[PDB]
Amino acid sequence: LRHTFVVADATLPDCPLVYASEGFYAMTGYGPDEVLGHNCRFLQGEGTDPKEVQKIRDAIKKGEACSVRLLNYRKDGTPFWNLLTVTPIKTPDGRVSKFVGVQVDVTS
Numbered sequence: 001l002r003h004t005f006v007v008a009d010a011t012l013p014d015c016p017l018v019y020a021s022e023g024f025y026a027m028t029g030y031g032p033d034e035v036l037g038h039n040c041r042f043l044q045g046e047g048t049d050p051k052e053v054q055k056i057r058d059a060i061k062k063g064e065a066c067s068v069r070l071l072n073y074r075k076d077g078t079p080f081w082n083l084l085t086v087t088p089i090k091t092p093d094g095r096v097s098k099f100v101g102v103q104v105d106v107t108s
């Protein structure tokens with residue numbers, strides 16, 4: 001299937017993005033100049049279920065994996081449905097270093 005992929009840096013307190021696949025830019029309508037160094041939450045908007053947003057926020061603090069269905073918005077404002085799965089990446093000493101996320105547009 002069609003998917004995008006991003007990398008967040010968990011050694012920084014707010015998990016900024018540090019690498020995004022070609023499709024993530026092409027999908028969301030954002031450029032690296034507006035994406036790298038920012039938390040992925042810039043994709044959210046009015047109809048984004050605060051309950052699901054909390055499932056990922058909580059999962060990041062605990063360092064667990066997490067799969068949620070969110071309502072994101074492109075740069076032009078048009079909504080799309082994003083199936084997000086974040087995976088914690090730990091170092092040998094168990095601490096979390098990176099968060100990896102596959103995003104799928106399941107607007108169908």
Ligand SMILES: *[C@@]12=NC3=[C]C([C])=C([C])[C]=C3N([C][C]([O])[C]([O])[C]([O])[C]OP([O])([O])=O)C1=NC(=O)[N]C2=O
Binds near residue numbers: 044070082084
């Ligand atoms: C976003 N993708 C995404 C990818 C990774 C690797 C991570 C760690 C998070 C996301 N998010 C969530 C966002 O960064 C944040 O964690 C949430 O907003 C919850 O935290 P707050 O502080 O806001 O309560 C993604 N969110 C999206 O909406 N779209 C994605 O593609």
